[PDB]
Design a protein around this ligand. Sequence first.
Ligand code: NFG
Ligand code: NFG
Ligand code: CA
Length: 769
Amino acid sequence: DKISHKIDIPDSAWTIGIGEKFKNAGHPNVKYPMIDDSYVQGAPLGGFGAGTIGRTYNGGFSRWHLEIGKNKYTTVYANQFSVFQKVEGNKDGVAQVLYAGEPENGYLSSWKWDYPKESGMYYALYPNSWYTYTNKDLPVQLAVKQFSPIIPYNYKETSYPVAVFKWTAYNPTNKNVDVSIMFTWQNMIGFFGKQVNVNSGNFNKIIKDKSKDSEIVAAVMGNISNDNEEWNGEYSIGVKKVPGVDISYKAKFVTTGDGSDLWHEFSKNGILDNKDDETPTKQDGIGSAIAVNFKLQPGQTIEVPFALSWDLPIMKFGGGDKWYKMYTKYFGKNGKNSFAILKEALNNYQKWEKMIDDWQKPILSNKSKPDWYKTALFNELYYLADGGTAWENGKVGEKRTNNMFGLLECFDYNYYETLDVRFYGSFPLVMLWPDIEKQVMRQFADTINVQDSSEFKVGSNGAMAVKKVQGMIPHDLGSSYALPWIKINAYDWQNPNIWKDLNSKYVLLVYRDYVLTGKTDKEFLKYTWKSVKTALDKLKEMDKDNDGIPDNEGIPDQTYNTWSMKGTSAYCGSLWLAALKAAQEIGKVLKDNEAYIKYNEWYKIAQQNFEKELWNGEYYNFDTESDHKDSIMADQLAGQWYADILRLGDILPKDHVQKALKKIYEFNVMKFENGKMGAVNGMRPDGIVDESDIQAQEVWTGVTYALASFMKYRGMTEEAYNTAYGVYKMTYDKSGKGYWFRTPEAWTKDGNYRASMYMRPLSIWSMEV
Ligand SMILES: O=[N+]([O-])c1ccc(O[C@@H]2O[C@H](CO)[C@@H](O)[C@H](O)[C@H]2F)c([N+](=O)[O-])c1
Ligand SMILES: O=[N+]([O-])c1ccc(O[C@@H]2O[C@H](CO)[C@@H](O)[C@H](O)[C@H]2F)c([N+](=O)[O-])c1
Ligand SMILES: [Ca+2]
């Protein structure tokens, strides 16, 4: 490896060998069908709300999130980079697709597949990833840096459906070598959203944009239809000329054939035919190719940028609604703008690289933090783009000031903005994209007094319930299978209108968003204040026994949706206490004296009773009425965790909080698989895991990262990082279970998982507060 020195990969990048087999991989541990796309994954490309594309460490474009809200894992084999090399003096060169695999059927059989093992590495530090190619049959060593411009405090480039591929080529040998790099791409119009004739009308055109000191050559892969539908739009690939390189292209090769129309050209001398052909296809799949060819002298380096864009302006959800995607604000809505997007990327990628470096640098440069922590911190952010992210710029045929936003819980449970989970998962948004965060919270505020008396069948018990009760915060803002932002509470397995954590978490999120954006946004507090008061007042009505605390009902009525709490729980009770303290503080800011007094009174009573009912001398009991009420819950003091972040002070005594956290580390971490796998949710006082429900026996990745942040704030530095390390290890390390770029909600002691690609572990960003 002589190419790594010519590029700048951070030491904290996650690494794996190209073509590496992973032996230890985990699988779903539930009885029902669950997504398992394997460990062959990578950092995604694509902006927020753009649709994303997962290019794996093997080189394939395989995890397709272009249909917003859907996860489709299939390798589109025509989508590749390939290389040709010929040493000056040899009669023949060699050509190789840079993919560690081959197609399953006979399409593209002419291409040179099966990039060999032990011949290159993949690196990732989201939003960047890299591949290096160090192959005994490729005298010129190559690397590529690939990324999309995901930039904190930037709502423009961050939305773009674009990727850059910045290639570096170096000749360490003593002979001249002719080199070509070729990008192939299938015209994927009709890959989704088209019910018949999936390739019909697809056609490819070549754009040559020549001006002074700029030449861009691109293929635009579109359809003859000017219809405005979810399926229609354009893909583009292309390259920017640099000194010493020539560009060639092929506008149309058949992807549903043996590929030799293209490959006979590329494998000869790495130069394509420059054949334009705008003939639309009927049944055949078609694709385009863009190549560069150059001669490298001994010791010479060259850099050349390629790019990929996709202009698919309309997202459709299963309930029938069609919306424009965010990026259309910047490029238009007609679906004929892929070249414009590509050109912007090819002309500005160096600036974008520096913007990414500028935001990553303060963390990367902090030599007090271990590299493993940085690996997880940055790479967990993959989910902000890969979580079915929806970000609208108008309903098709409808303009508003704001752009509604939603992130999925996960794909197995297809619910946008599950608030009980976003309590943990939304940290990166408040810290790095606060205008999105505040928009989402205003969406929730607007739902508070919505009443929908239509009934639904509650899946767990068969009872009928009102869809949405006035004064109750919704569990979620809909499903991609139905009507995001329009039909809320798509979750129907239980009734969200009786949950005991939604209303408190809502208030805590509101106050969090004020505090972590500088305690200056009074307008945000004003917008949300009525909903905050309503939320707390409604929750107070669920106190059955007049102890001042809402009662859990002995069935699941909070985020641990199969683990029943009864009476006063540490979890919901502590959240309630913190939410009351937050509302007091908002009351002071807004000069609402009567609210301040009321919530102060409720707080003092509830605090006294919480302590009496639950403090046992060592920790806070799980609850007051369950069979295993004395279990040690990892998340028992979630309200105090948020109170620390919100600078609300001690809601419980410092000594008792310290004792409880030490107990949790000693038991839930250190007595669970030697503290190498995170914090198990429930442990009995005898040091055996609580077996009352599956969720008690699970480590929740997002709960564990949040607990690590709580320990860190309380000065338990070693315990904090040791706790978080188990989650990092399981996700990323060779000794783990292979969950990189698909961090699950949970695993059990065997390492097997539930719900890959999960919102909650974004909570690792609470460790940066
Ligand atoms: O000059 N050539 O080497 C060559 C070879 C195959 C060619 O055509 C190829 O034929 C294969 C066998 O029917 C099909 O599977 C491919 O789809 C087609 F590209 C072409 N061509 O039509 O461009 C040229
Ligand atoms: O998920 N959301 O973004 C969202 C927002 C407002 C929503 O609700 C809307 O709220 C407005 C302001 O409170 C009211 O004027 C409308 O009557 C109501 F439809 C809903 N919803 O009714 O399901 C959902
Ligand atoms: Ca009570």
